[PDB]
A and B are shown apart, each in its own frame.
With several copies, the nearest count.
Chain A
Amino acid sequence: TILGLSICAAIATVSVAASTWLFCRSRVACLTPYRLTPNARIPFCLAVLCCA
Chain B
Amino acid sequence: RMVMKLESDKTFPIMLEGKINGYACVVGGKLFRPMHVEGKIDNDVLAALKTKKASKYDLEYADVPQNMRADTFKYTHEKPQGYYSWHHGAVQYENGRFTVPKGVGAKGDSGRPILDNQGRVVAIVLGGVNEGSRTALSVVMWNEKGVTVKYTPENCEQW
Q: List residues of chain A with CB under 8 Å of any chain B CB.
A: 29, 32-41, 44
Query: Which B residues are in CB contact (< 8 Å) with A37?
Result: 28, 142, 146-148
Would B147 and A39 count as touching, CB distance under 8 A? no
26 A–B contacts from the bound complex (CB under 8 Å): A32-B54, A32-B56, A32-B57, A33-B57, A33-B147, A33-B148, A33-B149, A34-B146, A34-B147, A35-B61, A36-B30, A36-B32, A36-B57, A36-B148, A37-B28, A37-B142, A38-B27, A38-B28, A38-B29, A38-B30, A39-B28, A39-B29, A39-B75, A39-B146, A40-B30, A41-B146
State the total of A-B contacts with C-beta under 8 angstroms. Answer: 38
Which label, helix, strand, loop or mixed, suits the secondary structure of the B interface? Answer: loop
Residue of A with least CB distance to B121: A38
Query: Which B residues are in CB contact (< 8 Å) with A40?
Result: 30
Residue of A with least CB distance to B32: A36
Q: List residues of chain B with CB under 8 Å of any chain A CB.
A: 27-30, 32, 54, 56-57, 59, 61, 75, 95, 142, 145-149
Would B56 and A36 count as touching, CB distance under 8 A? no
Residue of A with least CB distance to B140: A36
Residue of A with least CB distance to B64: A38
C-alpha gap A39/B32 in the complex (Å): 13
Query: Which B residues are in CB contact (< 8 Å) with A32?
Result: 54, 56-57
C-alpha gap A38/B75 in the complex (Å): 8
C-alpha gap A30/B142 in the complex (Å): 16
Query: Which A residues are in CB contact (< 8 Å) with B59?
Result: 36
Query: Which A residues are in CB contact (< 8 Å) with B146?
Result: 34, 37, 39, 41
Would A36 and B145 count as touching, CB distance under 8 A? no
C-alpha gap A41/B28 in the complex (Å): 12
B116 CB → nearest A CB, Å: 15
